[PDB]
């Protein structure tokens, strides 16, 4: 637990000193108004020039006591239309899987950039929901319209 929290303090400090424009990552508030280092609320801007452009997509990041030996669990809230996002919101990504591409050196910044990258490059070998996967595979112009519509909806204003 202490190993996890020491790392999470370092992560928080580095994020505060330098994060990418439009991104948000802050420990969430416990019900008593304290903050919880093991549970962050985050936000990811759609990349420019892509149909995600203008959208801001919120997600939660949960760290376990054996972090950074294990990756955090990441979940969009609300759930998104995207081939690699489960109906629950959970994000399916290989650097987020302990038995695959996760390494302890991976930073929170790298996780959020890796998730942003996933938004515009769906991974067809690892679909997590029926609808976005089917439409992406069968009707790519309809896929792009749903994404654009969704990006419009999550436009902050």
């Amino acid at each position: 637990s202490g190993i996890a929290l020491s790392r999470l303090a370092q992560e928080r400090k580095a994020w505060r000193k330098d994060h990418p424009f439009g991104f948000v990552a802050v420990p969430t508030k416990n019900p008593d108004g304290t903050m919880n280092l093991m549970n962050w609320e985050c936000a990811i801007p759609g990349k420019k020039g892509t149909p995600w452009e203008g959208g801001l997509f919120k997600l939660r990041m949960l760290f376990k006591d054996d972090y950074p030996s294990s990756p955090p669990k990441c979940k969009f809230e609300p759930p998104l239309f995207h081939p690699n996002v489960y109906p629950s919101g959970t994000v399916c990504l290989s650097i987020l899987e302990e038995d695959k591409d996760w390494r302890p050196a991976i930073t929170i910044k790298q996780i959020l950039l890796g998730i942003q990258e996933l938004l515009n490059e769906p991974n067809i070998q690892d679909p997590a929901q029926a609808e976005a996967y089917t439409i992406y595979c069968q009707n790519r112009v309809e896929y792009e319209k749903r994404v654009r519509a969704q990006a419009k909806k999550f436009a902050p204003s």
Partner: protein, 101 residues
């Protein structure tokens, strides 16, 4: 990693008094974040506005802080971390809010 022990009345000292009079003033931190060492990553005081201000009037005991509790204070603007051991004391007298041992 240096360590200090502070005596105070856990039911009378506010979060704000801990932040401003103890951690900033007495221990010379400029922009401290203070964590309760409960193994849950509880952040009691944040140097970011406006993240923990809503708790400034609350007594330390409202957050489970008691005799023997450990806080970790970490300065955002210096390389400076400090472990604070809490001794609960109800006998400091009318002119004293806290004592460094």
């Amino acid at each position: 990693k240096p360590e200090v022990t502070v005596r105070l009345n856990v039911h009378k000292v506010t979060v704000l008094t801990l932040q401003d009079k103890i951690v900033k003033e007495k221990f010379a931190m400029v922009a401290p974040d203070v964590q309760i060492e409960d193994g849950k990553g509880t952040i009691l005081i944040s140097s970011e506005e406006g993240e923990t201000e809503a708790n400034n009037h609350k007594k330390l005991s409202e957050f489970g802080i008691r005799n023997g509790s450990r806080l970790q204070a970490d300065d955002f603007l210096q390389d400076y971390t400090l472990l604070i051991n809490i001794l609960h004391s109800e006998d400091l007298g009318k002119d004293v809010e806290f004592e460094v041992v």
